[PDB]
Amino acid sequence: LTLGNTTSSVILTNYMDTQYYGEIGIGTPPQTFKVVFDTGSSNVWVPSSKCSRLYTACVYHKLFDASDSSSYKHNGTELTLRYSTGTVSGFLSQDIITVGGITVTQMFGEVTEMPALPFMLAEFDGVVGMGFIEQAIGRVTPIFDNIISQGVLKEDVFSFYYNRDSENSQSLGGQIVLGGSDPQHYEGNFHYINLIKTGVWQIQMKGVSVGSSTLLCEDGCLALVDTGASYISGSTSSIEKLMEALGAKKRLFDYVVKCNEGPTLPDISFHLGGKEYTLTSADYVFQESYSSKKLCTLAIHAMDIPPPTGPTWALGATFIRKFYTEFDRRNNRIGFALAR
Ligand SMILES: CC[C@H](C[C@H](O)[C@@H](N)CN1CC(=O)N(c2ccccc2Cl)CC1(C)C)C(=O)N[C@@H]1[C@@H]2C[C@@H]3C[C@H]1C[C@@](O)(C3)C2
Ligand SMILES: *[C@@H]1O[C@H](CO)[C@@H](O)[C@H](O)[C@H]1NC(C)=O
């Protein structure tokens, strides 16, 4: 592990509080793609020009076309990524990738099979996996590992800032710092929690409290910190119980309350390491109206994450929006600080 003197940032756009994505270029000359930087996974991929146009999701996204890149290097090994919420499939290629002004030779999936659900609902084209190599499919070095190798970054860490969605363009949607954190976007001190184990961005959670009565995760539980998840999530059975405590109605994909009931909802607290992380209802209610005649969705969802990573809660965009997040690969921990 060699360290340098550099920090790089990636400017993110915020689509509807649910997808935070930045721009990368692949190939010579660069082909640009909108991508999510996803700590829940470790593979890079973008849709391929070899994706059959019978996948409509391929009709509606940018396609990487190897035949137009002079730095491409073929490989071709089959690759399937089976996330908890959908799957993609294709084959591995290598090309040069530009991210935050850093150029790195990276092996990545060209995706030729991309389901309309969920992918038709993606504003982004691809994914940049930010997790450990232990979780990379095909044993492919993740992009951050390859950048670390160049010995240019000041610290073996990266940090996420997710903004609250603005209508006004001079609000940046968010920011990733590779090799550091950005003190403009947090205040107070970081508090850290150790990873249970290297290989996964998952920490122990000591309790989940709702208001001043209800207690979940009473004996302890897992918290995956997932920058590529829209929401905070829990196991179906946990969320069943959290939602009971809030007076919420279950639908197929989400929970809702009558919009007028939203601001009366208690705080929700997450006990991580030394500290309680508290969200008020404004942090977890999509308060689109104050009417009793309208439903408001909640940014806390049920999700069963498979083993071995699950069963687990996941702290996604709903959480990061309040808490500036640092991922420390040197010391295998995660730090949180109040975002600003
Ligand atoms: C362990 C949880 C982890 C979660 C996952 O990284 C998601 N956060 C990714 N998101 C899903 C999603 O649904 N997105 C989405 C959001 C809004 C609209 C449309 C879309 Cl497609 C965006 C992305 C970034 C693709 C995972 O399954 N990881 C899987 C990876 C890594 C490792 C653990 C799991 C099984 C593996 O075989 C090994 C592959
Ligand atoms: C793809 O990459 C792996 C990684 O070392 C390699 O062993 C394999 O032979 C490659 N396949 C081809 C056809 O280039």
Domains of the chain, earliest start first: 7-181 (2.40.70.10), 182-339 (2.40.70.10)
| Residue from 43, 72, 74, 77 whose mutation best tests the ligand 2 pocket (most atoms within 8 A of CB) | 77
Chain centroid to CA 28 = 28
Judge whether 8 and 101 are in contact, CB under 8 Å.
yes
By alpha-carbon position, which residue is closest to atom 10 of ligand 2? 75
Task: Tell me how the structure was determined.
Answer: X-ray
By the 8 A CB rule, do 174 and 227 touch?
no
Could you give the CA distance from residue 264 to residue 211 in angstroms, rounded to a whole number? 11
| Partners of 82 in the β-ladder | 87
For ligand 2, atom 8, which residue shows the shortest CA distance? 75
Query: Cα dist. 217→80, 95, 208, 328 in Å?
Result: 33, 44, 6, 25
Q: Which two tokens stand for residue 125?
A: 């084209």
Distance of CA 99 to the CA centre of its chain: 17
Q: Is 76 in the pocket of ligand 2 (CB under 6 A)?
A: yes
> CA 17, 282, 131 angle in degrees (round to 5)?
40
Single-letter residue type at 190: F
Centre of ligand 1 from the C-alpha of residue 249, in Å: 26
Q: Compute the distance from residue 31 Cα to the ligand 2 centre, in Å.
A: 24
Instruction: Map the chain to HEC letters.
Output: CCCCCECEEEEEEEECCCEEEEEEEECCCCEEEEEEEECCCCCEEEEECCCCCCCHHHHCCCCECHHHCCCCEEEEEEEEEEECCEEEEEEEEEEEEEECCEEEEEEEEEEEECCHHHHCCCCCCEEEECCCHHHCHHHCCCHHHHHHHCCCECCCEEEEEECCCCCCCCCCCEEEEECCCCHHHEEEEEEEEEECCCCCCEEEECEEEECCCEEECCCCEEEEECCCCCCEEECHHHHHHHHHHHCCEECCCCEEEEHHHHHHCCCEEEEECCEEEEECHHHHECCCCCCCCCEEEECEEECCCCCCCCCCEEECHHHHHHEEEEEECCCCEEEEEEEC
* Residues preceding gaps in the chain (C to N > 2.5 Å): none
Ligand 1 pocket check for 121: Cβ under 6 Å? yes
Resolution in angstroms comes to: 2.6
Is the alpha carbon torsion for 83, 87, 92, 95 positive or negative?
negative
**Ligand 2: distance of its center to the CA of 91 in Å?**
11
Nearest-angstrom CA–CA distance, 292 and 21 = 34
Considering all CA atoms of the chain, what is the largest pairwise distance in Å, rounded to the nearest integer? Answer: 62
Please state the length of the chain.
Answer: 340
Tokens of 99: 């991210």
Ligand nearest to the CA of 37: 1
